[PDB]
Write a sequence for this structure.
């Protein structure tokens, strides 16, 4: 069965304390990967579910509260750019979508061992708070309620067509020669193009040059975007961090403030002409008019009224008229639609789960059930892959992909 | 007719300035009883409607702004625990759901005498504000936006199955022998069990021992619950107190703050797996996964989006597939469902009215009309009783029950 | 075609920098007229669209940030009361609905010239902020989140039946004799009655006597109303001003505060018995129970939940059972309904557009399309008039009316 197979991927990809996203392709600990993977471990061993998160904070979190996107636990030649490019166990210098508090809330509420639950939640609570504080300190200096990402890897959706025009401004002059390693594990046509990677590395070198100084990175990055996905996830995490606080009887401090200001911000990203949520390019000072599946994530946050949810429900159904499987990462009628190339079209299991949870909350039971059925069927037929063709259902990207197996286990719990 | 009969109960139960909930059974002034009863008096004599509330504050409200749940106006042997157990005219040392500002808002808006309206509203406004302030001072020291009740009588829903596990922790060692008086007026099978009353009194003695000190009561009570009902009622009252302020041109001070923070809090009580609002046990640090009719009360508050209201509408309809009359106080499929025993199943007229008002606001006209029709039919056939069997419609609890007659008059105005 | 004809009205009514609402009838610059008219100019010449707003601020805005309702650019005998009555280029001493930031947001987002866009938006941003600040300073001293208008011209809906009882209190003793000029350009039966104008002038003379002192005007005006229209427009403008700030990377200062407090306030105006939003009379301290088309404007603001939008959708459909064209300015079953007299029944193109945009946002596509079709058909058959008979579709009020032509061009863009 699906579940038995799912467990084996998690056990094979386990390195003891953390779980790699994929053998070789992703030989390190990733931030939002580890959060979703923790949910899967709840179906195998709770102790080890918590452990995934403890390892993430204990080895990942810097003194300023920043949680980086990769914790480079063990040497490897299989991944670029590795610790030596970042030049800092070693970690990357950027962050990823802060889905962790949401995952911590579920672990806390549902652990059968209530003494363990409380120990781990009290231990992680202030660390969560420091992470969110770093986000607003580093990425929201005008106190807007929205946070910027300074690198498209921080969205978790690396080559999303929303980032194309923002990335066009990143200078690519006199970059060191590098050899990519991802294309040894995955077909190149399924990964970002070199123009993309040149720009990904140019940003990393600007950041390393500026010594990963939050203030300077913000001032000088040629890439500054209010990602609808990162911010919807953050609004959701804030609401779950608030719940934790009240349940644990901790001082919620300024969490309420984050929530209230975040709600004004997240709903500002709505474009009434297009009937969709867009990420914003702050360098250009404009909305990025590109409908990606991150634009559904405010449903996960719970900020929209029913009428906006309705309009999103209608949009997903339209995408379903072309795509055999929901939910493709970009409008399949988009000129940028590429049904096999990463975040430019393929279906992803984690986004399916989030958007489904979201639609369920707003009463769209049939659509939420379609997203679940599509996810499970894709995984029944092609195993646990990083993403899938929305037209054909063909597995793409990483094989033995940990969060696919984790969410399969979680969603069928 | 129903209305003529309703008036007579109010006139018979009137003690001049206040109205008892029921002759003998409840021979004193109750807090949320008197608020709903005031609405009924609006259909007989407005002066006397206001008077109900004036008496409540003038004789009930302590120096710290606390409004207690019982004002022990006249000696009686018919009720236990009476003023001498509480040991403090005398009052109890605990509060009840703060529905009063909402009732004060209606009285103010609708009194045909506009000079009276303004006198009474200006007189009561600062007293209302002090009451709410006491709530946040005594019961929300971490400034969460949610307030705890420290005793299940404070919910107004004394033996709700949500309180069972919280109550299990209340020590019952070496309690004085007492004789219950409620079971002289009502069948025992319709009232709380002795295990319940032992625990109710143990909490009262801890509170009397700690001299009803808000700070110590909060720190030491073995019972600490965020009641969804108390807090939904409080959110609604806050919004109505804000309206009063603007209408009277009074400084709303921190009411906005209460409303904004309260809205974050009340919506945190939603459990997405169960599709329902739960009260929270802060001693255990967990949601209490028990669906009671208090979980519908956020509709009265107006905080949910339409999708949550939808899911609640679906839940009420399911309860209606078993129960002949809506709205039973607990899911009729609950293992704790007891169709005659107080707040563990019976239908209540005040909760019917609140939940109906709530569903009406969210567009569920048919369900709201069903709740009204059910309430009025129950009262047509069995008179004005405290609660009713949801299966058979048989009258239960107190006879000549004042808020049933009051709401009957109000709801058919 | 409609569009070609629309352009000619704007070019004929253009005085170079600003556009008059109507030749002769309205020979000056009006505040909310110029905002809607700017949207029309976007379909002809963007430079000139911006210019409309620049002229409004550069010549209109006082040192305290107040934006007045009329900028009296050029001498004329065609209008009363003109600059010499106000006694202050000259301007009036009162304001109008602050729809400007919303219009500025659209201009900014859509200007094909991105350098121009940024210049104009950065230039106008702090001026917008000062205008809103003046509103809260002058008109919200208790920091309610709602602002009062002190004169029914400030609503933009001069003789709305909601103002009748508030106006009844304005003293009309020993007023100077005046001659009205509006009735030279428009049938008197289509304009306000003399009892109205006596009261309009009495307020202007009290204000001129008190030297247009914000503090004294607020304390002494016999007319003080929380207009649902002005405040819904302001909530919408605040949300758009917030968007601008984030897009421009300007410090949003207290805009979030305005939005959060404004949302509590605007939703307090909802009357659950009537199923509608009412303006409030603060002199009487009561809701004004009169359903006008301003009561739909919270849909433009985006504050209601779907259930209130639903109830409003049902109300508009009822009004449509009597009225051949939506949306009449007052419930056609109202005893105050006058199908030709200004804001007491006629259909208006700007309110149609706003309420349609609003219903679209809440998923009421059919109703929004009806409002648009009705607007365009009214303008196809009777040209561009100030308002129209909802029963017959007959043109009323000003001829060659600028915002009708502007919105016709805009809405068919
Ligand atoms: Cl909603």
């Amino acid at each position: 069965p699906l579940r038995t197979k799912a467990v084996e991927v998690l056990q094979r990809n386990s390195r003891g304390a953390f779980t790699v996203p994929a053998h070789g392709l992703y030989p390190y600990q990733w931030l939002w990967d580890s959060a979703f993977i923790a949910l899967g471990w709840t179906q195998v061993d709770w102790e080890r579910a918590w452990q995934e998160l403890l390892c993430l904070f204990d080895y990942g979190q810097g003194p300023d509260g920043m949680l980086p996107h990769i914790v480079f636990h063990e040497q490897s030649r299989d991944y670029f750019p590795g610790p030596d490019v970042w030049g800092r166990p070693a970690t990357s210098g950027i962050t990823q979508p802060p889905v962790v508090a949401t995952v911590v809330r579920y672990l806390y509420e549902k652990d059968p061992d209530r003494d363990r639950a409380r120990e781990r939640a009290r231990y992680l609570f202030p660390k969560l708070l420091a992470f969110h504080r770093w986000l607003y300190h580093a990425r929201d200096p005008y106190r807007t309620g929205l946070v910027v990402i300074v690198h498209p890897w921080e969205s978790g959706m690396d080559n999303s067509p929303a980032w194309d025009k923002p990335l066009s401004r990143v200078p690519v002059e006199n970059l060191p020669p590098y050899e990519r390693r991802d294309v040894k594990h995955v077909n190149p046509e399924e990964r970002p193009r070199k123009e993309d990677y040149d720009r990904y590395l140019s940003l990393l070198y600007l950041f390393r040059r500026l010594e990963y100084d939050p203030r300077e990175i913000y001032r000088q990055s040629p890439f500054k975007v209010v990602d609808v996905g990162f911010n919807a996830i953050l609004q959701r995490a804030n609401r779950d961090l608030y719940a934790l606080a009240v349940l644990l009887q901790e001082d919620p401090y300024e969490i309420e403030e984050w929530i209230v200001r975040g709600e004004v911000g997240l709903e500002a990203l709505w474009d009434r002409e297009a009937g969709f949520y867009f990420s914003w390019d702050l360098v250009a000072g404009e909305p990025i008019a590109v409908k990606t599946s991150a634009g559904f994530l405010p449903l996960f946050a719970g900020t929209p009224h029913q009428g906006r949810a309705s309009l999103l429900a209608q949009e997903a159904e339209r995408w379903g008229e072309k795509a055999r499987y929901l939910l493709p990462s970009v409008d399949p009628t988009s000129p940028f639609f590429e049904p096999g190339r990463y975040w430019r079209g393929p279906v992803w299991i984690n986004v399916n789960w989030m958007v489904a949870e979201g639609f369920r909350d707003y009463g769209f039971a049939a659509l939420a059930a379609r997203l679940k059925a599509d996810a499970l069927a894709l995984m029944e037929r092609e195993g646990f892959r990083e993403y899938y063709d929305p037209l054909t259902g063909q597995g793409r990207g990483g094989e033995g992909f940990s969060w696919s197996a984790a969410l399969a286990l979680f969603w069928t719990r």
Notes: Chain A has one domain: 1-413. The longest helix of chain A spans residues 114-139.
